[PDB]
Amino acid sequence: ASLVASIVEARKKRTAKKNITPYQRGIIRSLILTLDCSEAMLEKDLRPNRHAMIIQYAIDFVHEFFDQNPISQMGIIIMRNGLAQLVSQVSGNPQDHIDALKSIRKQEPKGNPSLQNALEMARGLLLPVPAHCTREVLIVFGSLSTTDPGDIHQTIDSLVSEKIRVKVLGLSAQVAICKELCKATNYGDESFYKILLDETHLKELFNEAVTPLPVNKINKGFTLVKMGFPTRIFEDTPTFCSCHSKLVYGGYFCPNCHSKVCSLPTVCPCCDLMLILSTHLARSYHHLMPLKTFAEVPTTEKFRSEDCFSCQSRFPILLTSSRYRCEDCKQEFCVDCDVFIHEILHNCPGCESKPV
């Protein structure tokens, strides 16, 4: 009955994955990562300490976020001594944020946190963002109390007026103001206030925060954005770069002003034009055309082939059929493949192979 228990647990896990719909998502994101560095973060519930674990997971989150959202931007704020300290300006360079976190990890946390100060700083940082981008603020809260100079409700109302979206990750227990913020700022949705249960669940929450958030039906900001695809240049002599004013072997040439830029994607330093590559856009097509879930075949019916279509592997033989099929093409897949096609790849080999 233990093996059947494992099978039923797998079925329950797949139950959530069954419901998938092509929700509209805002690929162009502007995220403000607020971290809590207060006396309450000196506890040892997370080894070695909350500050160390949170900073490490923040570094990993930055890597993943800039891996899967090339055309997004991020900024870093911390809460110390009841004040909001900016440590990274909004920019598209992951290395700057990684270095900022590496600098932050040293200082010992102390003082009290100030959600109102952090939110005001985030609003100021997100003011100069285009209307077509999604303004988001991810806060890692650890304290159970908030000390603020002004009225937090007014700040919440201002955030709602500015159409900013706030996600809060707690450590110990729910805070009433945090719940109200995450609810009123997300059109009443109460699923954006998460309290972790352990280190693994914290990692899962951080990974979940990476994917873009679906947009609201009534919040329409549809528009066309002027972007250009530069051509890489290979030169024999180093030349001055127009972004950092430093010598580099080569750089991408903007197609609107011919100025060279070190790395992409970044806003052109001369014509204020966004420079991106086709791959950067290609990285987000799976968020617009998600692959439909695969449903296991009951053992009552007859199987098609004894080996996996995608990997040519013998199906294990024993109670519960270890087969997964794609409704679009009706091709049996093994359990090992299913996760790979639904986590790494985003195209069904059977669907691609089937002619029309």
Binding site: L144, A173, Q174, A176
Partner: protein, 752 residues
Amino acid sequence: MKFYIDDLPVLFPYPKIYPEQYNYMCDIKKTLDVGGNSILEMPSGTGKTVSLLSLTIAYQMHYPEHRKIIYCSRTMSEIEKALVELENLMDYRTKELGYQEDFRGLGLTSRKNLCLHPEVSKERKGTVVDEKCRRMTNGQAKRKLEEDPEANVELCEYHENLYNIEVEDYLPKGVFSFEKLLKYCEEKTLCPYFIVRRMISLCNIIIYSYHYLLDPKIAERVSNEVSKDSIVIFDEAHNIDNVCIESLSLDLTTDALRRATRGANALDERISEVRKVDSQKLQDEYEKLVQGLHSADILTDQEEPFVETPVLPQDLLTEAIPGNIRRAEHFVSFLKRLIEYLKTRMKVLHVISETPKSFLQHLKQLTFIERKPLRFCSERLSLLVRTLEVTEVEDFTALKDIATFATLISTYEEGFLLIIEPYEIENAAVPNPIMRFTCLDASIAIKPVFERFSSVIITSGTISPLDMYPRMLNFKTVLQKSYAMTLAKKSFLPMIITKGSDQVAISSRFEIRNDPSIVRNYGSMLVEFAKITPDGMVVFFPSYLYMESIVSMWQTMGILDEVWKHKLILVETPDAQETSLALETYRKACSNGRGAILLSVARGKVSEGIDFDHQYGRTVLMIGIPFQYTESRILKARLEFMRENYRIRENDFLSFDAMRHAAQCLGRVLRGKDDYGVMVLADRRFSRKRSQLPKWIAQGLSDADLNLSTDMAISNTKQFLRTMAQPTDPKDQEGVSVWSYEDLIKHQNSRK
């Protein structure tokens, strides 16, 4: 939703309904259909008022009897909450039935809470407000103005404007809470107090407090208007015995007697002056008295007696005045010598407890005052004060206490006692004698209600055990039961802490109140729990003196300094306005995330109606069993009377009294089933009181939490909060704790 009972359609104001609510409504309907009284205990985390109002309103609007509804709560804030719930229910009914059905529902309270006069509503006491309103509405001013317009006496525009319109057009059809009523009456310059007092006889449902139903001083006039076949609901009736006892209890002090002598002398001088100038009034009053008329036949409906009837209407003699107090001067001399006898009895050197019969016999021996003339003191004084044109009654205010005491002691003899103590406060340099006339039987005040009304529902969240209430108050119930909430996941964590982190026993015994170990243990518990509590933390102390002393000790030790870093501190104070402002500040601090801790008395003003739910109430620290002061003559006499009559042991009754208040405070944490909290009972003596707690709390109290330590309770609290912070699975509560219409229909089909 809109579902059906055996023959009664009921419209619930929510798309979802709890199984506890459905069973509660079914039981209430069964009680109403079968006739008689019933006792219902519903969990505090499940909607009780909404279910009561829905079922009763549907019953009244469906059956042809159209029996009216009387709702009796324990506090005015509860009246406001009930009125708001009724307004919501009526809004839902109006939206579902397509029209506003003919319905009128009002609350009722005193003048102080409904006065709009800019010069009379600015008083700090209700008696002065009542006196001024009487001066403006008795009809003396109106008659004087009619006879001579030049008279400087002024009237109340709000009262005068009511005469223009009829009673049936005072307010539009609907439900009027106090807030909406005040707004409407301010926009139309009308008196809400008189509107309610003149519309009680017409409203479908009337909501007031237990004092307006039990206290004869204000109960007779209101009860004379309500119907006899109406439904009666007692909400939060676990503490009704205290109200019933304080209804018929009086206290007289040396200052009171000294002021009564001055009042009597002033009355004699007034009688002399009126005899000199205008004696026809005295002659007319004497002539009317001779025939056998009383205050009812003499006073007009517009005016009220100066002295409120202190005895129940059924115990008032219907015979003419005895004759000894028929004349003003004779009555004044009688009253003066009564006051002198009280003064000479206030000189005892040791506690004396005596029956009213013994007191009357000694009075008849030393002086020549008989029982019958004494029984008419208040009525005769009311008539005399009415006829003496005493517009200013500041001097005569004192005589009210003497009249009340005389009319009570000469009326009741069984279940009443008189205690004379040379030391009102034992901690006093000079003796301060006090005379207390106490009612020991709690059923005397409530017998008329249980006999006048056929069906009575007694409902509460922490009324247990249910067997004692029929014993204490002489009434019988068709059914008495408590409901077990069908929670899918535990939402409240009740635990008992018997010792501190050092393994030293902790208790709130008064004799060891100033103990460094116990005080430090309690302070450490407070700080540790405040460190983990997210938003709000309510601490309930056994008594205000204990709270004051322990808080001062904590201040000296520096524990409050540690608490200040994590939360604001709000403290209950004797001043009601200051306490209300403290409550508002505490709620604001809980809402804005700053975090707050509120210290209060388990038997205080907060615990008698203020409810802490969601963000407001997260952890409840019951610091010690709220035991009464054992070395109290009144409590000892009551315990002896109960032991002799109802065969209730003193220890059993004391434990019941304390556990009732502990549960009362505990139950103010949950509103719905999505609310959660930690309930810590910090005393070694709770460990054996699990069987005495309400059923829904005992079921949630695990065997491993019967005797815990501070550190282990902190760990359990942290784990519980972390667990309760996760999203609930909808399937886990889809049809096991929350029922939709289809689930309700399935339950009905399976049951049938």
